[PDB]
């Protein structure tokens, strides 16, 4: 579990999203995994607006957090789980780390700020869903 909180909006990963965030939806889009609500109070999370391939990620399997190189947004191809059929994810980046079901919504940081969230596990891989490009996050 895991949220960023940006201004007066809260990013979740979507296949954890609450019924009470999609009554204050502000964005979803399930190709990404993410889900964007709106809330009252204003939050204190700045996101990186960079290139970094390098950052530190919280594990919650193992109360850690650890130094990690990370690729690109891309679209990779995601089993199916008990959230979503087999289908491909956009805008996923992978680490070499360790995640397990209960990571999702780990912050991804850089020098910058927050690059994104815990959204794939497995295999002795990670894999964040970016928001870098989200610019409306920050207005
Ligand atoms: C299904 N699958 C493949 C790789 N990873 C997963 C698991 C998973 C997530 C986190 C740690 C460990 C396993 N995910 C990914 C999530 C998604 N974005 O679709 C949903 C889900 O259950
Ligand atoms: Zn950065």
């Not at 609450?18 to 964007?36: F, G, I, K, P, Y």
């Not at 191809?77 to 008990?82: D, I, L, Q, R």
Request: charged share 20%.
């Amino acid at each position: 579990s895991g949220a960023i909180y940006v201004g007066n909006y809260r990013v979740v990963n979507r296949h954890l999203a609450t019924h009470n965030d999609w009554a204050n939806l502000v964005w979803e889009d399930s190709s990404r995994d993410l889900l964007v609500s709106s809330t009252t109070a204003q939050g204190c999370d700045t996101i990186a607006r960079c290139d970094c391939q390098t950052g530190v990620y919280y594990c919650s399997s193992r109360r850690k957090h650890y130094p990690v190189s990370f690729s690109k947004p891309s679209l990779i191809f995601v089993e199916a789980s008990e959230y979503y059929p087999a289908r491909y994810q956009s805008h996923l980046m992978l680490a070499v780390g360790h995640s397990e079901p209960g990571d999702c919504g780990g912050i991804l940081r850089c020098q910058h700020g927050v690059v994104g969230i815990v959204s794939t596990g497995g295999n002795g891989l990670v894999g964040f869903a970016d928001v870098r490009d989200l610019l409306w996050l920050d207005e």
